[PDB]
Amino acid sequence: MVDIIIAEHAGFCFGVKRAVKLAEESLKESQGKVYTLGPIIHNPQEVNRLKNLGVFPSQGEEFKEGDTVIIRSHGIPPEKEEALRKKGLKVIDATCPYVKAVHEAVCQLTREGYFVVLVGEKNHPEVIGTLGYLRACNGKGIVVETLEDIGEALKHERVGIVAQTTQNEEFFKEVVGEIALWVKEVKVINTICNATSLRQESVKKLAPEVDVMIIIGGKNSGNTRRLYYISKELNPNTYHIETAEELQPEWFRGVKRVGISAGASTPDWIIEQVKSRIQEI
Amino acid sequence: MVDIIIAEHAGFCFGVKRAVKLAEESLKESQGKVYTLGPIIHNPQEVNRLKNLGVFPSQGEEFKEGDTVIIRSHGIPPEKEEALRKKGLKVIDATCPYVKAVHEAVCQLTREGYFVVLVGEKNHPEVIGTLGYLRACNGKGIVVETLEDIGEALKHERVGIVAQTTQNEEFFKEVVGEIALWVKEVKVINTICNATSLRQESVKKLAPEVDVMIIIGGKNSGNTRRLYYISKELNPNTYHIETAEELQPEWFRGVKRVGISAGASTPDWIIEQVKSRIQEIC
Numbered sequence: 050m051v052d053i054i055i056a057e058h059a060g061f062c063f064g065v066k067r068a069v070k071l072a073e074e075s076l077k078e079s080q081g082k083v084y085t086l087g088p089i090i091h092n093p094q095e096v097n098r099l100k101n102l103g104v105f106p107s108q109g110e111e112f113k114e115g116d117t118v119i120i121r122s123h124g125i126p127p128e129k130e131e132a133l134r135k136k137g138l139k140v141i142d143a144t145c146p147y148v149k150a151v152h153e154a155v156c157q158l159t160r161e162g163y164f165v166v167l168v169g170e171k172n173h174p175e176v177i178g179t180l181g182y183l184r185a186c187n188g189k190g191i192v193v194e195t196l197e198d199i200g201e202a203l204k205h206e207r208v209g210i211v212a213q214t215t216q217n218e219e220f221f222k223e224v225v226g227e228i229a230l231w232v233k234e235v236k237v238i239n240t241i242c243n244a245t246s247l248r249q250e251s252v253k254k255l256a257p258e259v260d261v262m263i264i265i266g267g268k269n270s271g272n273t274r275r276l277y278y279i280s281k282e283l284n285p286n287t288y289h290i291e292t293a294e295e296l297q298p299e300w301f302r303g304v305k306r307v308g309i310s311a312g313a314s315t316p317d318w319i320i321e322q323v324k325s326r327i328q329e330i
Numbered sequence: 331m332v333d334i335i336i337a338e339h340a341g342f343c344f345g346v347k348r349a350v351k352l353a354e355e356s357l358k359e360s361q362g363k364v365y366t367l368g369p370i371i372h373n374p375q376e377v378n379r380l381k382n383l384g385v386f387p388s389q390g391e392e393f394k395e396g397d398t399v400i401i402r403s404h405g406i407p408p409e410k411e412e413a414l415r416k417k418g419l420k421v422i423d424a425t426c427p428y429v430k431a432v433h434e435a436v437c438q439l440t441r442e443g444y445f446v447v448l449v450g451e452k453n454h455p456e457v458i459g460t461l462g463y464l465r466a467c468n469g470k471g472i473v474v475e476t477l478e479d480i481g482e483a484l485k486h487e488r489v490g491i492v493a494q495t496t497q498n499e500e501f502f503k504e505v506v507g508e509i510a511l512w513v514k515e516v517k518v519i520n521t522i523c524n525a526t527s528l529r530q531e532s533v534k535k536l537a538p539e540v541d542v543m544i545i546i547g548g549k550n551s552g553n554t555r556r557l558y559y560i561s562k563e564l565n566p567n568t569y570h571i572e573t574a575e576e577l578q579p580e581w582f583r584g585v586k587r588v589g590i591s592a593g594a595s596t597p598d599w600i601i602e603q604v605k606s607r608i609q610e611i612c
C-alpha cells in the first residue's frame with residue numbers, strides 16, 4: 050500500500066543511461082586510458098563524476114594505441130569509427146539503439162529505391178552520422194531542417210522520410226504531409242524516439258496516485274518545466290526542485306505517498322539524494 | 331464583337347470526356363440497346379443530349395442479354411462488372427485511367443503487406459468500387475472520411491495510404507501526417523487527380539487578365555461554385571450562369587476581353603452556346 054516512488058523513466062533517457070553504463074563498465078580491465086569522444090553529455094557534474102572514475106572527455110586526437118574510446122549516443126560516420134579502430138583504439142560503441150535504427154532505416158530505404166529525406170538539424174552530430182551511413186550504403190538524400198529544404202526531394206518520384214531521433218513531431222508531420230502532396234510515392238519510417246513521451250506519461254500515471262509530486266531539474270530547464278506542468282494539472286500539490294536542499298520538511302505533513310520524477314539532465318544519484326532526504330522527513 | 335477566351339481546362343476532365351466519347355462510339359458496335367450504368371454525369375442537359383443519340387441512362391436492371399452497358403468514370407466493384415458480363419451484356423469499361431490507378435495501388439499496397447487507408451467519401455461510388463478491388467486482392471483496410479476514422483489504422487504497424495481521386499489535398503495532408511506520427515511505417519501513393527487544381531489555377535490566371543469573367547455550371551455543383559468565388563475574388567465582374575439565357579447584355583458594355591470557364595459537369599457544347607451568345611451580344 051504505502052509508497053514513496055520514483056517514476057519510471059525519470060532522468061536520463063535510455064540511450065544516455067546505457068552510454069553511462071558502458072563507460073563505467075569499460076574501466077574494469079582497461080589496459081589503457083579510457084576516453085569518451087568529447088563529453089558524454091551536456092551536464093558538467095556528470096562529466097566530472099565520470100572523470101573522477103577515470104573516464105576522460107577527449108579534447109582532440111590525444112588518445113593512443115591501446116586506449117579506449119567511447120562513441121557518444123549520437124553516433125559518428127562509419128568511416129570515422131573505422132579510422133579510430135585503425136589507430137589501434139579499443140572502440141566502445143555507445144551509439145543509441147534508436148540512433149542505430151535511423152542508420153538502418155536510411156539504408157533500408159536506399160535498398161528499396163527511395164531518395165532519402167532526413168528531417169532534422171543539419172549541423173547536429175546525429176544527423177552527420179546518419180549522412181555517413183546513407184553515403185556508405187550508396188544512398189542519396191538531403192537534410193530537411195525547414196520547409197524550404199524540401200525542393201530537392203520534390204524532383205524525385207519516390208521519397209523515403211526518416212527523422213532525427215529528437216525531431217519535433219509537429220514539424221515532422223508537416224514535412225511528411227507536404228512532401229506527400231508533391232511526389233508520387235512517399236515512404237515514412239518514423240524514427241522519432243519515445244524518451245520524452247515515456248518520461249511524461251509515467252509522471253501522468255504517478256501524479257494522481259500520490260499525495261505530493263517532486264519534479265527534479267534545473268529551474269530554467271525547459272523539459273523539467275514541462276514535466277512540472279504536466280504533474281501540476283493532475284496534482285496541484287506539486288513542487289519543482291533542483292537539489293535535495295530545497296526539500297522542505299513542512300511539505301510532507303500528513304502525506305502517506307511521495308512521487309518523484311526528474312528532467313532529462315538529472316542523473317540518478319541526484320534523484321537518489323532527493324529520495325534519501327525525503328525518507329528522513 | 332470582341333475577344334473571347336475560353337480558359338484552359340474549362341469543363342469536363344480527361345476521364346469524363348473519355349467516358350462520353352466511349353459512350354458515343356459504342357453506338358457503332360452495339361446491336362442491342364446502349365445504356366450507361368446510371369446517368370453518365372450530373373447534368374440533365376448532357377444526359378438528355380446522349381439520350382437523344384441512343385445512349386440511355388439506366389434506372390435499374392432493365393438491360394437485357396445483348397444490350398451494351400457503359401461503366402461510368404468512377405468505376406464499379408470487380409464482382410459487379412463480372413455480374414454484368416455473366417448476364418450476357420456487352421460491357422464497355424469507361425472507368426477513368428486515374429481511378430483504375432487507385433484500384434492498382436490498393437492491390438500493390440496489399441501485396442507489399444500494408445493495411446490500406448483510403449482517404450475519401452465512404453458512400454461515394456468511386457470509393458465503393460475501390461473497396462471492391464481491395465477485397466478482391468485479399469487486402470484489408472478502411473475509408474477515412476474524417477480524422478476520427480483513423481483509429482483502426484493506428485492498430486497496425488504498416489499502413490498504406492491512397493486517396494479518392496477528388497479528395498481535397500488539405501485533409502489528405504493532415505491524415506498522412508497524423509498516421510505517420512502513430513505508426514511505424516507509412517507508405518503513401520498519392521492518387522489525387524490534378525483536374526480540379528488545373529481548372530482553378532487557369533481561372534486564377536485568366537481572371538485579372540480580362541474585363542468580365544463568365545463561370546458556367548449547375549448551381550448545386552460545389553466545384554463550379556468554387557470557380558465562381560475564386561474568380562469573383564480576383565475580378566468583381568465574375569458572373570455565374572447555368573445557361574446562355576442568363577447572359578445579360580448589360581454585363582458586356584464597353585468590354586474588350588471576355589473570359590469563360592466552366593465546372594467539371596459542363597460539356598463543351600454548352601460553353602460554345604455561351605461563347606456565341608456573347609458574340610451575339612457584341
Ligand code: F3S
Nearest residue numbers: 062064145147214242
Ligand atoms: S539517447 Fe535518448 S533521447 Fe532517445 S535517441 Fe536515445 S533514448
Ligand code: F3S
Nearest residue numbers: 343345426495523525
Ligand atoms: S474522371 Fe476526372 S477529375 Fe480526374 S480522376 Fe479522372 S480525370
